[PDB]
Amino acid sequence: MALVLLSFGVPRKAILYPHEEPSWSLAKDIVFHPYWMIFGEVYAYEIDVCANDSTLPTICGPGTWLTPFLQAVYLFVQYIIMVNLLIAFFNN
Amino acid sequence: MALVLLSFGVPRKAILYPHEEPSWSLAKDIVFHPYWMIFGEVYAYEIDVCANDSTLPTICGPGTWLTPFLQAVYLFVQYIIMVNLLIAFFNN
Numbered sequence: 700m701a702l703v704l705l706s707f708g709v710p711r712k713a714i715l716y717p718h719e720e721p722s723w724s725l726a727k728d729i730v731f732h733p734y735w736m737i738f739g740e741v742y743a744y745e746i747d748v749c750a751n752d753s754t755l756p757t758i759c760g761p762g763t764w765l766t767p768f769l770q771a772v773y774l775f776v777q778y779i780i781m782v783n784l785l786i787a788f789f790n791n
Numbered sequence: 792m793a794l795v796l797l798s799f800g801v802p803r804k805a806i807l808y809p810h811e812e813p814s815w816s817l818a819k820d821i822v823f824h825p826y827w828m829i830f831g832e833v834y835a836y837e838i839d840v841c842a843n844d845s846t847l848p849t850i851c852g853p854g855t856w857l858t859p860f861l862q863a864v865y866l867f868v869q870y871i872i873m874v875n876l877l878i879a880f881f882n883n
């Protein structure tokens with residue numbers, strides 16, 4: 700689950716925040732929103748940052764249209780496959 | 792699951808946005824919110840667009856009272872039946 704989390708967190712941050720210098724905030728940002736997604740928080744108005752109803756309009760930029768596709772795959776794998784594998788283990 | 796998604800996405804967009812010219816945004820709009828519903832985002836303040844607490848007051852129009860009924864059926868089929876069928880397959 701942690702590897703799946705980082706496989707999404709790292710590209711999301713890199714695509715959406717391409718002007719960053721090194722900081723320990725990078726560590727937080729690559730884990731934080733992806734973890735809360737496990738529990739069904741999709742951050743609906745942050746998904747497409749170039750939409751009119753976006754709460755992150757300044758983040759709109761080149762390549763940012765990729766991250767909804769990434770998040771679509773992430774939740775399918777994380778929220779549906781991996782959480783229910785863990786639940787299947789707990790059921791045994 | 793994809794057919795169920797489009798069976799809801801297409802009427803929702805058509806009823807709520809009846810003045811559209813052809814664009815590739817139509818493709819996004821018929822899939823986007825219906826996909827995030829799979830994961831429990833109901834878009835609560837967008838459901839009834841003619842309500843006082845609606846975040847889409849300009850969308851209020853003829854026939855827009857239909858879309859809460861459509862979304863009620865969609866989530867029951869998608870969120871409850873189809874996701875748990877997929878989970879049942881994963882459990883096997």
Ligand SMILES: CCCCCCCC/C=C/CCCCCCCC(=O)O[C@@H](COC(=O)CCCCCCCCCCCCCCC)COP(=O)([O-])OCC[N+](C)(C)C
Binds near residue numbers: 701702705
């Ligand atoms: C540096 C960061 C990466 C590593 C993660 C460190 C954190 C902790 C997690 C650790 C997870 C790995 C645990 C196994 C390795 C420890 C020893 C072990 O048991 O080895 C086994 C092989 O080991 C492998 O095959 C491991 C291969 C490396 C995996 C690296 C990615 C994992 C993290 C993914 C990224 C997300 C999570 C992390 C967040 C980034 C062999 O063991 P054994 O003793 O021969 O067998 C025991 C049974 N016996 C008694 C019968 C013999």
Ligand SMILES: CCCCCCCC/C=C/CCCCCCCC(=O)O[C@@H](COC(=O)CCCCCCCCCCCCCCC)COP(=O)([O-])OCC[N+](C)(C)C
Binds near residue numbers: 723726727730
């Ligand atoms: C998992 C993948 C990510 C990368 C992995 C590598 C690890 C990365 C490690 C990073 C920690 C090392 C860098 C410390 C820098 C802290 C500076 C700072 O602003 O601190 C902030 C918080 O933090 C603290 O106050 C102290 C640090 C606590 C959090 C880290 C615990 C370790 C993670 C546990 C697991 C072990 C980790 C090991 C690996 C799993 C203080 O600022 P603020 O809270 O924003 O605001 C407070 C109020 N203020 C605004 C007035 C200030």
Ligand SMILES: CCCCCCCC/C=C/CCCCCCCC(=O)O[C@@H](COC(=O)CCCCCCCCCCCCCCC)COP(=O)([O-])OCC[N+](C)(C)C
Binds near residue numbers: 701704724734
């Ligand atoms: C997959 C990884 C798991 C590995 C093990 C555990 C790893 C633990 C976590 C590692 C990530 C980094 C830890 C924090 C330190 C870096 C941030 C920092 O220094 O400061 C930041 C604050 O930081 C906080 O306030 C701390 C909150 C951290 C997230 C904890 C919840 C998510 C848990 C996820 C668990 C995933 C478990 C996965 C299982 C499925 C920012 O402060 P600053 O730097 O001053 O910046 C200025 C900010 N300011 C101006 C707004 C004030």
Ligand SMILES: CCCCCCCC/C=C/CCCCCCCC(=O)O[C@@H](COC(=O)CCCCCCCCCCCCCCC)COP(=O)([O-])OCC[N+](C)(C)C
Binds near residue numbers: 750
């Ligand atoms: C059933 C369907 C799946 C079929 C296969 C996969 C199909 C993949 C999906 C296809 C839908 C359409 C793809 C995008 C291209 C059209 C939109 C476009 O051109 O621009 C739009 C942006 O578009 C984006 O920012 C891209 C985000 C698309 C949504 C991805 C997540 C949903 C995943 C769903 C996955 C469902 C999986 C179902 C499984 C249950 C709008 O930009 P514009 O046109 O310039 O308009 C101006 C807007 N502006 C002024 C605000 C800037």
Ligand SMILES: CCCCCCCC/C=C/CCCCCCCC(=O)O[C@@H](COC(=O)CCCCCCCCCCCCCCC)COP(=O)([O-])OCC[N+](C)(C)C
Binds near residue numbers: 793794797
């Ligand atoms: C153009 C868009 C619609 C099509 C979708 C294309 C996308 C991809 C999805 C494709 C899903 C369909 C896969 C099956 C068809 C491929 C070949 C096949 O296996 O045929 C089978 C019959 O095939 C049918 O009965 C298909 C009937 C058409 C379904 C059209 C709607 C599906 C998409 C709904 C809309 C939502 C999803 C899409 C997003 C809009 C017979 O196969 P066979 O080889 O005889 O049997 C193999 C076993 N053997 C080796 C023992 C013999």
Ligand SMILES: CCCCCCCC/C=C/CCCCCCCC(=O)O[C@@H](COC(=O)CCCCCCCCCCCCCCC)COP(=O)([O-])OCC[N+](C)(C)C
Binds near residue numbers: 749759818821822
């Ligand atoms: C699934 C059911 C729906 C219909 C399906 C039919 C296919 C529909 C296909 C549509 C794509 C083909 C037409 C191109 C339109 C792009 C114009 C545009 O606005 O681009 C936008 C994004 O998009 C891009 O930048 C390029 C397109 C990438 C996303 C779509 C990939 C295909 C979906 C994958 C799966 C295969 C699909 C095949 C079938 C499954 C750029 O604009 P923005 O992001 O809004 O804003 C960014 C900032 N700006 C404002 C400064 C610009």
Ligand SMILES: CCCCCCCC/C=C\CCCCCCCC(=O)O[C@@H](COC(=O)CCCCCCCCCCCCCCC)COP(=O)([O-])OCC[N+](C)(C)C
Binds near residue numbers: 759
């Ligand atoms: C094995 C297959 C290999 C792939 C082959 C296909 C290759 C790709 C084919 C089609 C993708 C669509 C074309 C790209 C988008 C066009 C728009 C553009 O040029 O500018 C975009 C960025 O600038 C770029 O140059 C983006 C280039 C994308 C990199 C390649 C993506 C690969 C996708 C992975 C492949 C997965 C395939 C599907 C798997 C399920 C947007 O710019 P803007 O937003 O307008 O700028 C903001 C302006 N502002 C700052 C003022 C706000």
Ligand SMILES: CCCCCCCC/C=C\CCCCCCCC(=O)O[C@@H](COC(=O)CCCCCCCCCCCCCCC)COP(=O)([O-])OCC[N+](C)(C)C
Binds near residue numbers: 851852853
């Ligand atoms: C096979 C079974 C047979 C079906 C029999 C039942 C048939 C239905 C019987 C009754 C439905 C209720 C009556 C219609 C709505 C009343 C309001 C009205 O007249 O105006 C409406 C539009 O104008 C219309 O003419 C809407 C007509 C709806 C099409 C028919 C619906 C079929 C439902 C499917 C049947 C499923 C049955 C249940 C299944 C579980 C609203 O106008 P407004 O919003 O005031 O305008 C906005 C003004 N503004 C722009 C300034 C903001």
Ligand SMILES: C[C@@H]1CC[C@@]2(OC1)O[C@H]1C[C@H]3[C@@H]4CC=C5C[C@@H](OCCC(CO)CO)CC[C@]5(C)[C@H]4CC[C@]3(C)[C@H]1[C@@H]2C
Binds near residue numbers: 705721722725726
């Ligand atoms: C198997 C996994 C692959 C992914 C991964 O784990 C293992 O690989 C690790 C590499 C880490 C970075 C290494 C170096 C730094 C520089 C530091 O800079 C000082 C601070 C500054 C403040 O201003 C001084 O002034 C900031 C932190 C950063 C960017 C790390 C972040 C976490 C990263 C990306 C980790 C990530 C989760």
Ligand SMILES: C[C@@H]1CC[C@@]2(OC1)O[C@H]1C[C@H]3[C@@H]4CC=C5C[C@@H](OCCC(CO)CO)CC[C@]5(C)[C@H]4CC[C@]3(C)[C@H]1[C@@H]2C
Binds near residue numbers: 797813815817818
């Ligand atoms: C089995 C499934 C039934 C549903 C469905 O899949 C198969 O059937 C497909 C038909 C598609 C549309 C066909 C033609 C166009 C015109 C184009 O116009 C140029 C743009 C303009 C920009 O300004 C040029 O300048 C825009 C796209 C649009 C409306 C398609 C959208 C997706 C649709 C609705 C698809 C939908 C998901």
Ligand SMILES: [Ca+2]
Binds near residue numbers: 739830
């Ligand atoms: Ca939920």
